[PDB]
Design a protein around this ligand. Structure first.
Ligand SMILES: NC(=O)N[C@@H](CC(=O)O)C(=O)O
Ligand SMILES: N[C@@H](CC(=O)O)C(=O)O
Ligand SMILES: N[C@@H](CC(=O)O)C(=O)O
Lengths: 307, 319, 323
């Protein structure tokens, strides 16, 4: 439509990493996501992907990611074939490759989540249709990064210039890896606080490939093992994560007394006690809204890929 | 069309938690709407009333009828289902009930929840922006079973006022009989209710006491029995029986009474010519297969009514 | 302008339990219809033929191709699927098979049933109002597999009559080879069938005897071996090999042992050097090491294209049953 033009660059293409997107890619998707959101909240009913099929291939469990993918597909008028791993012909000795080839025979796109990092590369090698990396081990989670970025944009108004805190298990947290990559390559970030005990800090295999962009844009990088008052007062985003002593990163109503008036708290979810329920009532808690921005970002993605 | 399938306005955008929330007029509007739903589906007509709306099942215990009929009802309105699991979720990585509700709520137009705890429903409500349809909360209620059950009685017998009905089996833990007693007693002039169970599994006081005014104003007879006596067999228009749901004395009393509360072809010889056997299902041997060929065996038709009655509910909720 | 999708009339309103219930004419008609399904779906066209119709899977043992393929096919006709799970259902409270059939039959227009008991499909039939498609009954039959297997031979080789076909591997428990042998011998002029299997896993007498009349009357040569001889490799137009059906205890052990121990049935690039230029390798799937990944590059490897054929054969089956 004039109203919902797909993002041309994403057509017919798998999504494995946040590295594959340009700054233009992200904003085209953001604006497309906002258009999708306005049409849906009005009660408009899209038939954009009628006759098209997504198949989830989840070798690890998910609540959100599965559900937001499916809902996104459906709200575009597309369909889902409900493949399960536990009740499948994997049990009879079949291999990942043959499994992938199989669902490929029937589908227009695959959404894959897997505990091994290099499993996705293997899926690409045998797949004809697009695969969307919905999480590869401790590797990446690219579409979360995109929707995270939509959230920041939509809530605060700009992504350029922000100071962001990445909190929790940065070592194994695939969300924070895609997010860092996405933000630093495609925006001008003031400062990034990496908040974690040393054991779970942001890995070098993430930081080093970003170093040129970090340096060239003059982005500040500080490591702390705590949510110190400096982190609380300066951050426009507190993005915190699950584990995969804890007092020094927990965010509660009290801690929130030190935050600015114009900032948000975000969490890819699910959460443990790092993010107290005391916070939920605060208009700065955007971690529930995040999931709805998720659905619309995923509509944008699916449409752009399959248009 | 609003001529053919007028939704039931009172149900617009509201959660369904109890049989207590409905009025007589509500139950009748839903009955007539379900029957109209049925006449269309049976004639091959396709409906598109709910294109682009999503129903998410949220089932923490097993189901065959209620899951499936809900999914089928939604599809037959042209709506969609997101097949969310609890066993294949991030509830494994330490996620709580409210967070789970707030999640599915981001995506859905209506939620359908079955949960082993009674209070699990009131907890979900407090955080949900979208209607939740209670598909069973522990041993509490199963309000939409009560509605399809009442649909069954009405379509098969022709009237609900004036009936004698026996509720049979595990009445303690049977959320089906809790909701069905409340809905009939509160909204119809029931002649007699037989409560057929051993003491250990009798109908709970917390169901019966809230009904005392209805019971006295409408003059309903309530008799407890521990057996399907000849009286109960000869006088009942509806025999509605239930599985025994699996502390020590309950097991035993159930063992002591099982043959007395079992319905089989032999027992049906004492039944009226016009009456019905019902069972929300699933069943064990409290209801013999020997009864399945009898015209009064209404427990299979019962399921189909469920789909059509849930079509009426879904459409009225989301109109 | 476009192709018609006439339903195959004789399938209307009927259960599919066995390869035996099909005539040659039904097979070609379904084949042709599946090809027109193919050309429509691959052209991007959106089918709305079975809107408002419901398919319910009633799988009492694992499946990937078959479950997924049926759901896809239903979706691509404009139909819908109620994702009922046997393992997470009221059977875990003692519900019978029949009550479970009657349950889903209450909501569905068609049931796709797979079950480890040979006779369970029979149980199901006796109570279901709506058609049931047998998607696997123990070690019995797998009749939609046979139909797609035949599609795959037709589209790939150009003819089914006149072919020499090897059925290899676990022929005793292999429901797929059971239905396919029956379906080929009763409706086509097969030149020769090689039965490549160790003695313990050979093709059973309860499949071979009912076909005796047909085999003799039509001159169908039948050769048993326990190895992929050079003869078998050199003469065969189709190498349809199969997985050892482990899921199906001391003769049991010797039967498991026999596949690779009294073997020589592995197919790999080395064995393939001996094959015709014009031939195909098929495997209904999943595979184990009987079908090496070294064959996958070979254009003669048809076992992936087979799963695609199968979706289209299945769209054809479902439209014909439900139109
Ligand atoms: N976004 C998700 O779907 N989950 C995250 C967050 C987490 O699981 O901790 C992940 O690690 O994949
Ligand atoms: N399934 C119904 C009745 C039963 O289980 O026997 C319920 O649990 O409400
Ligand atoms: N998948 C096929 C073959 C096999 O399982 O080996 C069947 O179920 O019969």
């Amino acid at each position: 439509m004039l109203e919902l033009p797909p993002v041309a660059s994403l057509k017919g293409k798998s999504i494995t990493s946040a590295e594959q997107f340009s700054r233009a890619d992200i904003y085209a998707l953001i604006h497309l996501a906002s258009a999708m959101q306005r049409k849906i909240d009005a009660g408009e009913v899209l038939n954009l992907l009628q006759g098209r099929i997504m198949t989830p291939l989840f070798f690890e469990d998910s609540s959100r990611t599965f559900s937001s993918f499916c809902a996104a597909m459906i709200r575009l008028g597309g369909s889902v074939v409900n493949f399960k791993v536990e009740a499948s012909s994997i049990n009879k000795g079949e291999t990942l490759a043959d499994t992938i080839r199989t669902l490929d025979s029937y589908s227009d796109v695959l959404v894959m989540r897997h505990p091994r990092q290099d499993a996705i590369e293997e899926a690409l090698s045998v797949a004809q249709h697009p695969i969307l990396n919905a999480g590869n081990g401790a590797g990446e989670h690219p579409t979360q990064a995109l929707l995270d970025t939509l959230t920041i944009h939509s809530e605060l108004g700009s992504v350029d210039g922000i100071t962001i805190a990445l909190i929790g298990d940065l070592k194994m947290g695939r969300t924070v890896h895609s997010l860092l990559k996405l933000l630093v390559r495609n925006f001008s970030i003031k400062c990034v606080f990496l908040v974690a005990p040393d054991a779970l800090q942001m890995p070098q295999d993430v930081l080093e490939p970003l170093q040129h962009e970090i340096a060239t844009k003059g982005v500040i990088i500080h490591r702390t093992h705590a949510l110190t008052d400096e982190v609380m007062q300066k951050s426009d985003v507190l993005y915190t994560t699950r584990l995969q002593a804890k007092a020094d990163i927990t965010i509660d109503a009290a801690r929130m007394r030190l935050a600015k008036e114009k900032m948000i708290v975000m969490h890819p979810l699910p959460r443990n006690d790092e993010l107290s329920t005391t916070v939920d009532a605060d208009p700065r808690a955007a971690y529930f809204r995040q999931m709805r921005y998720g659905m619309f970002m995923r509509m944008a993605i699916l449409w752009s890929v399959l248009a």
